[PDB]
Amino acid sequence: NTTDNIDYFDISDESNYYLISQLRPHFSNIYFFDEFKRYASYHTEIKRYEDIHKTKVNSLLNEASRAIGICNRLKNTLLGLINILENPQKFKTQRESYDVLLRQYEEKKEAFRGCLLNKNRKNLDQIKKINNEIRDLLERLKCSQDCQTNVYWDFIKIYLVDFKKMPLENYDTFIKQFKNSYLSYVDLIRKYEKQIDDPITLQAIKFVLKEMGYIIDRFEYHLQKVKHAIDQITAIADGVKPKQVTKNELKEYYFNIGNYYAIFKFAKDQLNMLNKALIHKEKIVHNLLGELFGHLEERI
């Protein structure tokens, strides 16, 4: 097999509000529930959030993983097609045309991504329910007009330190190197299709390049999302430092920095996975080009 996992497929719901990943915890919103555990431990009135987290948040997370796993049968079928399409030797030892296999790939890709969303729809509703319960729990803060913002500000300072650990410049360097090499390969295959008589090898390379393009798009999408999250929290740190605020304001403060930090934490893992997926595709492309040039040498 040329490809052993397809963790790089993701899907958003129709409202574009939630993004579902195959990587646990599957939604960045779960990391928000995790960050709120940290905020609540500094407010005596809401320390009971720890019991909400260990019951409702843990159950939601395990329900999310269960939903993802319901789609494993479609995933395995899709992996089977991918491995025929990427591998000329496997294509030559079956009898479906390359065009029929490509159409089946498109159908199974959308059925698999659709399963990831469909089986998680009730989980998305439960995110909204737990968010609402957190908003209600915050009512128990004693303050009303005079809520202190020191915990909020302290966590912004922590987040800025955490942001420095992320290889953000290296990710820019990587996706640029990779996009440029991708576009070079695409242009190169377009020339080879006229100079080299090897449609079995060329069609497989073209397919792998098509996959690489999908994964590049995902990388760029998640990279823009985490840069936006860092920029938003950085602008808070660079802006007017609050004094005391109303309880309603403090709720929104924690939801804002908790959700953007959750986006950052979730993007870390998603980008690392997509970087690995792109390196894996590079390996496959180069080995296919080895075959292409070796066949060309043989035909002189």
Numbering used by the authors: 30 to 329
Task: Please share text taken word for word from the publication where this structure appeared.
Among these markers, the P. vivax reticulocyte-binding protein 2b (PvRBP2b), a member of the PvRBP family of protein adhesins, produces the top prediction for dormant P. vivax infection. PvRBP2b binds to human transferrin receptor 1 (TfR1) to mediate entry into reticulocytes. The surface of the N-terminal domain of the natural protein PvRBP2b (residues 169–470, PvRBP2b169-470) is a mostly positively charged α-helical protein comprising ten α-helices and two very short antiparallel β-sheets. We sought to design stabilized variants of PvRBP2b, under stringent conditions of minimally perturbing the solvent-accessible surfaces to maintain its antigenicity profile.
We designed six variants with the standard phylogenetic strategy (encoding 20–37 mutations from WT; designs WHT2476–WHT2481) and three with the ProteinMPNN-based PSSMs that exhibited fewer mutations (17–26; designs WHT2482, WHT2483, and WHT2484). To determine whether the designs retained the structure of the parental protein, we determined the crystal structures of WHT2483 and WHT2484 (19 and 26 mutations, respectively) to 2.4 Å and 1.9 Å resolution, respectively. The biggest divergence in the backbones occurs at the C-terminal portions of the α5 and α7 helices with up to 1.7 Å difference in position at His464 in the α7 helix in WHT2484. The main surface change is the reduction in positive charge in a patch on both WHT2483 and WHT2484 compared to the parental construct due to the introduction of the charge-swap mutation Arg418Glu. This is reflected in the overall reduction in the calculated pI from 9.2 for parent to 8.9 and 8.8 for WHT2483 and WHT2484, respectively. Comparison of the binding footprints of the human antibody panel with the mutations introduced in WHT2483 and WHT2484 reveals that the binding surfaces are largely conserved, with few of the introduced mutations being within the antibody bound surface of parental PvRBP2b169-470. There are three introduced mutations which fall within the antibody binding footprints, these are Lys248Leu and Met324Phe which are present in WHT2484, as well as Gln378Leu which is present in both WHT2483 and WHT2484. These mutations fall within the binding footprints of human mAbs 237235, 283284, and 241242, respectively. Despite the presence of these mutations, these human mAbs still bound with nanomolar affinities to the stabilized designs. Recognition may be retained for Lys248 and Met324 as the contacts are solely mediated by van der Waals interactions with the sidechains, which could either be retained by the residue swap or are long range (>5.0 Å).
